[PDB]
Amino acid sequence: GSCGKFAPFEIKEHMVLAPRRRTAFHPDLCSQLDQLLQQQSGEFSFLKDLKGRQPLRSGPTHVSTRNADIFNSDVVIVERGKGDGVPERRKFGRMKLLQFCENHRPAYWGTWNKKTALIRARDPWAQDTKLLDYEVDSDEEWEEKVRQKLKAKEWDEFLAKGKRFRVLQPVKIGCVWAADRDCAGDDLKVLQQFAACFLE
């Protein structure tokens, strides 16, 4: 659909375009509008019909390309250890992101569960005394158990063993020669631990 002298828009690999329309294409619709453009009858009250039905809404733009999002998971999560026993995450709500250009303090990324009855959306400048110390929070900040992700082999070993099972931490030491002068002394001693012992 090249318009004039301009090339058509090129959708990239992970690109999504918001829908150009929010309602199904009704064919006669436009023509009917023409009639309602000419009649100018005050019969219809839109606000009256608004309260008698549910508002028309649309969701966030999702991907719909053919064969777009197909993935594979080769890991099963095994959780071991009590840790600290933090409260349930679900009862804390969405994590709010609050960042400011003039704040030396880094961006805030976390939940907010404080409750007030006076900080209203109808009045953003509504003070809430004794609910939050009305001072700058930036100047003070100006100065500054186990969740294993087992693979198939590790999952089989965990099933065979149990909770006592732990993943393997491979230990490899590179080619360390006696002629090497810049070689690490730690690896040198670890390999000297296997030094040959001669018998006379």
């Binding site: 309602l36 649309s58 995450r89 880094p106 976390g110």
Partner: protein
């Protein structure tokens, strides 16, 4: 005199208290200071979702307002966290009792493309059929059309712009601009020359650089503040002018000096208009009366409703793409009011009525200066980007409990 100092002190105190109260009223706040003030702001339809990443990337079209420097049409990138990543049990602050911690997670706002532009960018709008094509209103009579794909990422070493298309027909600067969502290449512009210009750039040759006006409408007797195509009809378009008049024009009508319909919309200058996406008959116009009038196309003599909670002139009015009952309006009063149509004529408690009319839903007073232009995100609901006169761009979203409840 002392008026400027008093205003500055009051605005600074209001910004401080608003910043303190922002956790209760917002789920997303991103304050960014641009190099130059932007008179325009429009979300691009592109959203990139890199697989394996907990964020999406949106794009914004902005302008520059330089008193004595080279102006640029700007395309900028904004990173927004994914919905699935908004629930994360990373750290638990034992003191505040929240799953918070400032950490290192932050929204990345950076400029992607800068293009030269002779004079300030009054308003920049992209063609829906092709987001690569962007139309800009200059302080001159001509209207510029760019294809940012055919331009370098960094601007020219010197010299003014090299527009892909130059549109003639006007005789003074303007601010109202709209593409036709049903006819590709049909562009409408409104200027102080009391006329509305219509161009059809769908048949421009490859080497064609200047396009003359296809049609000129002269119904308005004052400065035509804004013009906007109808979202579903390829022949109807609305316009609001300084003559307190809103005109609905039909392109099939041969009389280009008399609109198909005329309405005395307001008692003073009407600066903007917008069509509801979910209703072919309903539109809204923001005036200098500090009011937003709701108009039904089936009955133009009677005003459906008048939103009255702004403290000064209103310059931009835009609907919510994801909700027909949600409207927004900004102006010189440094406030962005979000209204709910479903709350019109509802019984309100005496103390709640102190704050405003029942249809008023949210107030965005995070701007320290006049809000130049705001825009709704078409991909992320309730996300609004607003640019003000003090080179401040804010991409924000009010709290979920405010609208969902």
């Amino acid at each position: 005199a002392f008026d400027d100092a008093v205003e500055e002190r009051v605005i600074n105190e209001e910004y401080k208290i608003w910043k303190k109260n922002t956790p209760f009223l917002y789920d997303l706040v991103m304050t960014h200071a641009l190099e130059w003030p932007s008179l325009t702001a429009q979300w691009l339809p592109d959203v990139t979702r890199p697989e394996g990443k907990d964020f999406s990337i949106h794009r914004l079209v902005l302008g520059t307002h330089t008193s004595d420097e080279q102006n640029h049409l700007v395309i900028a990138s904004v990173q927004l966290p994914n919905d699935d990543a908004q629930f994360d049990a990373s750290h638990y602050d034992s003191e505040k009792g929240e799953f918070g911690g400032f950490g290192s997670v932050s929204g990345k706002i950076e400029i992607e493309i800068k293009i030269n532009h002779e004079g300030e960018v009054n308003r920049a709008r992209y063609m829906p059929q092709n987001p690569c094509i962007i139309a800009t209103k200059t302080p001159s009579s001509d209207v510029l059309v760019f294809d940012y794909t055919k331009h370098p990422s960094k601007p020219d070493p010197s010299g003014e712009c090299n527009p892909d298309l130059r549109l003639r027909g006007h005789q003074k600067e303007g601010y109202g601009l709209s593409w036709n969502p049903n006819l590709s290449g049909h562009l409408l512009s409104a200027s102080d020359d009391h006329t509305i210009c219509l161009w059809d750039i769908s048949a421009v040759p490859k080497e064609g650089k200047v396009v003359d006006a296809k049609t000129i409408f002269t119904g308005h007797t004052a400065v035509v503040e804004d013009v906007s195509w109808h979202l579903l009809h390829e022949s109807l378009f609305g316009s609001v002018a300084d003559d307190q008049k809103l005109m609905i024009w039909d392109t099939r009508s041969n009389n280009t000096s008399k609109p198909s319909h005329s309405v005395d919309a307001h008692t003073a200058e009407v600066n903007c208009l917008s069509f509801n996406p979910y209703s072919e008959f309903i539109l809204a116009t923001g005036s200098a009366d500090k009011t937003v009038a709701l108009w039904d196309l089936r009955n133009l003599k009677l005003k459906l409703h008048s939103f009255e909670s702004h403290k000064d002139e209103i310059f931009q009015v835009q609907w919510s793409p994801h909700n027909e009952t949600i409207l927004a309006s900004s102006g010189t009063d440094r406030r962005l009011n979000v209204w709910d149509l479903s709350k019109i004529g509802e019984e309100q408690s005496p103390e709640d009525a102190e704050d405003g009319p029942p249809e008023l839903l949210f107030i965005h007073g995070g701007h320290t200066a006049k809000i130049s232009d705001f825009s709704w995100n078409p991909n992320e609901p309730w996300v609004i980007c607003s640019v003000s006169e003090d080179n401040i761009m804010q991409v924000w979203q009010m709290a979920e409990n405010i609208y969902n409840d």
